[PDB]
Amino acid sequence: GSPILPKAENVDSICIDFTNSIQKIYDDSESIQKILSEIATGKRTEKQSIQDYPSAEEYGTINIENNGGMTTMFYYEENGKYYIECPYKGIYEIENNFEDMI
């Protein structure tokens, strides 16, 4: 069962400040749509995200700017799995890395 993302075609841009000093902006159709695949691969599971931030300290910063609003979110590795932040549906356990797949 996937996340409920915005559309692709209503995304104004997506900004990803990486963990390092570099940032990439996904403003092409193909750049956005690729993200909206691998960001939808994981399972937030039936848990409760009673949080609004990660508990890692090393992560990238993401803004999906869409319809002039955004979904802010953050991703990280913990204990050997990777994870994606969100409100009450943000415990997306994935078994693969984010940054190598973008």
1: its two tokens: 């069962």
Sign of CA dihedral 14, 4, 1, 82: positive
The C-alpha atoms of residue 61 and residue 45 are separated, in whole angstroms, by 22
The C-alpha atoms of residue 22 and residue 91 are separated, in whole angstroms, by 26
Range of the domain at 21: 1-102
DSSP sequence for the chain: ----PPPSTTEEEEEEE-SSS-EEEE-SHHHHHHHHHHTTSSB--SS----SS-S-SS-EEEEEEETTEEEEEEEEEEBTEEEE--STT--EEESS-STTT-
Please name the method used to determine this structure: NMR
43: its two tokens: 């399972």
Q: What is the CATH number of the domain that holds 101?
A: 2.60.40.4250
Q: Which residues pair with 74 in a beta bridge?
A: 61
Question: Alpha-carbon Rg of the chain, whole angstroms?
Answer: 13
Sheet holding 92-94, edge to edge: 23-26, 11-17, 60-66, 69-78, 81-84, 92-94
Q: Could you tell me how many residues make up the chain?
A: 102
Domain tally for the chain?
A: 1
Phi-psi region of 99 (alpha: psi -120 to 50; beta: other; left: phi over 0): alpha
